[PDB]
Amino acid sequence: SSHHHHHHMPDNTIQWDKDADGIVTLTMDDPSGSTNVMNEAYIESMGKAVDRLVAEKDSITGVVVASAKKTFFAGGDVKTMIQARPEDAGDVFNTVETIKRQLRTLETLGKPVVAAINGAALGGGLEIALACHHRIAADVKGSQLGLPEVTLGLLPGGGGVTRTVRMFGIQNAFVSVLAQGTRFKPAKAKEIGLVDELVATVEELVPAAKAWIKEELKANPDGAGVQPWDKKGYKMPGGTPSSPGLAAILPSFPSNLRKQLKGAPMPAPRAILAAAVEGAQVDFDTASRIESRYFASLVTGQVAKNMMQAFFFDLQAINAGGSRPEGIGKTPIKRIGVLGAGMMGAGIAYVSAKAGYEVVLKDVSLEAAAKGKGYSEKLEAKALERGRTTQERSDALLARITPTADAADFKGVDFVIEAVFENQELKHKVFGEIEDIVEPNAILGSNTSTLPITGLATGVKRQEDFIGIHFFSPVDKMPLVEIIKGEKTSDEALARVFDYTLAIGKTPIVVNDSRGFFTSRVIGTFVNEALAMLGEGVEPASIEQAGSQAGYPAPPLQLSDELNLELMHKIAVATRKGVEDAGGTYQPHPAEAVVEKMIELGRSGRLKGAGFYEYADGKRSGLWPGLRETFKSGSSQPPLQDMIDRMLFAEALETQKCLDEGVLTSTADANIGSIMGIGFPPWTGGSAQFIVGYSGPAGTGKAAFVARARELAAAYGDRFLPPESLLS
């Protein structure tokens, strides 16, 4: 029973100040970083401080928890959590038990404790504030509050699950706070109950906190320093699992969770719900201990290591300019010129104008360019009826989009983004009529998905400023930009497109010039595996189920109808000629006969009104009934796990080829690119992490991946054979 981790060294994190009134001000200020982090230094520092609060309890009337950083407290020690092996479960349990033993003492001190939240209070930081009896937040820009542990495959283990359930009940805490790790602005945090009151500036926080302590000691003398769940007669909102109202719908919560996850093997939300329900059946101390066991179960697991690797380390390395060329400085952007007002160009104009950039949206006719701006008006309309933006910021956003049909209106443009039809000589003509009108330092970007950038760059004279800027539909909701580097593309143009991508709120990856780039090439193998299985005679329902249960956002046949089978055949015609020049021609993927059989029948996709699904009034309505008779569905019934592994391994093995050929320069670009670009399941950590984190009957690791790949190769074809680089 100790507030320290070891019953048998790092720098102090917390400053101590007791005033004349006996109010102690614990100011967290980790001297080894810019943000207070729940590391070994904090645990020991709060251990010393909590010991002192008990030793000097006779001369202490209240406690204020403040911070000297720009943020309040955001993050755990991910460097340590990712190294926790299953044999370390004893240490992980003892650590979170010590953390919560400190917070439980601070919570039951017999005197009010106030959190002075001056900035971002995320994860462990909010868990600190949740241990206080009153939370005051400063309404500053950039401040967020929430428990994002689930987005890293973890759960709020410092009491977040136990306290949010005691505050809001099982259903409200899980849906609103715990299950998705939602981040709340200080205003919305007070509205739901995570924060109790607000102040305008950070300078008022500590005075307002000490003032609330003085008033609480005088107005509520017996309830001071006592949480609602520690008073006699506490009633959990929504009831306990034994309450008749909740016991009716409670056995249906795991089925709702399995529907939202679509059967994907993400274990973190399962554990959070389990810890929440099991905790509401017992006292607070026993509930907190149950939460520790589930936390240790996640941290020592593999999925948590995948998601920690991708959504913390890999994503930070990208945002820290990992793929950005060294030495190059910043260059502003004043006027963005978008060529083409399709669904792509319209979405590009929206995300650019939403960031404050002036956009000139051009098309072949003024009627067309205006309809592209209507895409932004309809998005601002839905955003206004839901109350997410003001009427003044919506009018200023649309005012930055200027539709036109004259090439002369591209005067003063220093950042060109072409989003026309996929065709080389068309892109050559479109760039030829505007390349001398834009500024001489203008970036010449091409939103092409397959055509090599070096070939498109010959149609301009300033080839050093020509570069591929590949977006994903819908642009207003897809977070990745694929930046393709042509042979003549300079490092300055690369960095300027990199900075543009961060400015619009997206994540960039740098890709060297090659057919299919990285996203189009890898997602093609995913679609090709599904179409192959359809030709092999597998039920179309089983194929779509395999896609969703693998963890993909959209099942493969549904996606094929959206990618257009006509365009899918053109990629087969294009890649045919490239390999014929080398030798041995190319082995036509079995999916190609399936694409042709669908085009011959006049079903090319959602665009043409009919594909693998029947489309009535735009909305998709059921699979094509003639699909089973066309491909003799049902004659092949492989295990569902084999359908899933065939789709995951094809993309993973294709990613490894891209890393070998030099298409990608880092596994961070591979993981975040596959996750944020084409929708690789987040529980894998990315199509490159999937190899080193594979888990199944063969075991776990790169060796088990090679074993399973060879098992697939014996059954379904040698395209699943692992490359030399994965062999050891």
Partner 1 sequence: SEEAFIYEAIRTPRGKQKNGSLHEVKPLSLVVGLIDELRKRHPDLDENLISDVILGCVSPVGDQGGDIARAAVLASGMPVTSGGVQLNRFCASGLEAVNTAAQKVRSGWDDLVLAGGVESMSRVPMGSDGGAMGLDPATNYDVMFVPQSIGADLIATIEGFSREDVDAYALRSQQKAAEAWSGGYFAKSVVPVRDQNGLLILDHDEHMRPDTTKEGLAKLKPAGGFDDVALQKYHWVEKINHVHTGGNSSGIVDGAALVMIGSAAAGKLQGLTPRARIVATATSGADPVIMLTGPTPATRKVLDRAGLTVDDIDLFELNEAFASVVLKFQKDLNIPDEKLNVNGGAIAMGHPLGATGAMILGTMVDELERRNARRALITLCIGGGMGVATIIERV
Residues 89-118, one symbol each (x = binds partner 1 by CB under 8 A, - = not), give: xx--x-------------------------
* Contact window for partner 1 (CB under 8 A) among 254-262, 333-341, 391-399, 675-683: 254-262
As a whole number of angstroms, the distance between CA 251 and CA 441 comes to 63
- Can residue 1 be called a binding residue for partner 1 (CB under 8 A)? no
- Can residue 242 be called a binding residue for partner 1 (CB under 8 A)? yes
Among 207, 626, 634, 723, binds partner 1 (CB under 8 A): 634
CB of 549 to partner 1, least distance (A): 6
CA nearest neighbour of 368 among 344, 349, 342, 407: 342
- Can residue 687 be called a binding residue for partner 1 (CB under 8 A)? no
CA nearest neighbour of 125 among 197, 204, 70: 70
* Contact window for partner 1 (CB under 8 A) among 136-144, 256-264, 353-361, 378-386: 256-264
CB nearer to partner 1: give 73 or 294.
294
As a whole number of angstroms, the distance between CA 4 and CA 333 comes to 53
Q: What is the DSSP string of 90-150?
A: HHHHHHHHHHHHHHHHHHTSSS-EEEEE-S-EETHHHHHHHTSSEEEEE--TT--EE-GGG
Q: Which two tokens stand for residue 564?
A: 């257009």
Whether residue 470 lies in the annotated active site = yes
Query: Is the Cβ–Cβ distance between 706 and 698 less than 8 Å?
Result: no
- Can residue 632 be called a binding residue for partner 1 (CB under 8 A)? no
Query: Is the Cβ–Cβ distance between 339 and 362 less than 8 Å?
Result: yes
CB of 290 to partner 1, least distance (A): 5
The catalytically annotated residue of 3, 133, 134, 470 is: 470
The beta strands (E) that lie in 449-537 are given as: 466-470, 480-485, 507-512
Binding-site size for partner 1 (CB under 8 A) equals 49
Regarding beta strands 145-146 and 183-184, do their DSSP bridges make them parallel or antiparallel, or are they unpaired? antiparallel
Q: Is 344 annotated as a binding residue?
A: yes
As a whole number of angstroms, the distance between CA 452 and CA 684 comes to 30
By three-state DSSP, how is residue 399 classified?
helix
- Can residue 247 be called a binding residue for partner 1 (CB under 8 A)? yes
Q: What is the chain's Cα-based Rg?
A: 28
CA nearest neighbour of 294 among 124, 160, 102: 160
Q: Is 362 annotated as a binding residue?
A: no
- Can residue 278 be called a binding residue for partner 1 (CB under 8 A)? yes
* Contact window for partner 1 (CB under 8 A) among 18-26, 292-300, 389-397, 598-606: 292-300
Q: Is 647 annotated as a binding residue?
A: no
As a whole number of angstroms, the distance between CA 81 and CA 99 comes to 15
CB of 560 to partner 1, least distance (A): 17
- Can residue 238 be called a binding residue for partner 1 (CB under 8 A)? no
Among 202, 277, 653, 678, binds partner 1 (CB under 8 A): 277
- Can residue 155 be called a binding residue for partner 1 (CB under 8 A)? no
CA nearest neighbour of 637 among 723, 568, 540: 540
Residues 379-418, one symbol each (x = binds partner 1 by CB under 8 A, - = not), give: ----------------------------------------
- Can residue 546 be called a binding residue for partner 1 (CB under 8 A)? yes
Q: Which two tokens stand for residue 725?
A: 């680089």
CB nearer to partner 1: give 637 or 725.
637
* Contact window for partner 1 (CB under 8 A) among 252-260, 324-332, 581-589, 668-676: 252-260
As a whole number of angstroms, the distance between CA 353 and CA 373 comes to 11
Among 237, 238, 263, 537, binds partner 1 (CB under 8 A): 263
Among 14, 43, 49, 273, binds partner 1 (CB under 8 A): 273
- Can residue 186 be called a binding residue for partner 1 (CB under 8 A)? no
Residue 685 CB contacts under 8 Å (≥ 6 apart), including other chains: 305, 306, 307, 308, 309, 310, 311, 671, 675, 693
As a whole number of angstroms, the distance between CA 459 and CA 618 comes to 38
Footprint of partner 1 on residues 62-91 (CB under 8 A)?
86, 89-90
Among 241, 322, 412, 638, binds partner 1 (CB under 8 A): 241
Among 540, 673, 679, 686, binds partner 1 (CB under 8 A): 540
CB nearer to partner 1: give 252 or 728.
252
CB of 613 to partner 1, least distance (A): 11
CB of 305 to partner 1, least distance (A): 16
Q: Which amino acid is at 576?
A: R
Among 218, 232, 259, 386, binds partner 1 (CB under 8 A): 259
Say which residue the tokens 């697991």 belong to.
Answer: 301
The beta strands (E) that lie in 662-701 are given as: 695-696, 699-700
As a whole number of angstroms, the distance between CA 321 and CA 550 comes to 31
The answer to whether the peptide bond before residue 508 is cis (omega within 30 degrees of 0) is no
CB of 99 to partner 1, least distance (A): 17
As a whole number of angstroms, the distance between CA 239 and CA 170 comes to 8
CB of 157 to partner 1, least distance (A): 13
Q: What is the DSSP letter of 662?
A: T
Give binding residues for NAD(+) as ranges. 341, 343-344, 363, 420, 422, 427, 447, 449
Give binding residues for CoA as ranges. 35, 74, 76-79, 124, 149, 172, 176, 183, 188, 191-192, 316
Active site residues: 470
Give binding residues for ADP as ranges. 640-641
- Site residues for partner 1 per CB under 8 A: 86, 89-90, 93, 241-242, 247-248, 250-260, 262-263, 270-271, 273-274, 277-278, 281-282, 286, 289-290, 293-294, 296-297, 300, 539-542, 545-546, 549, 622-623, 634, 637, 640
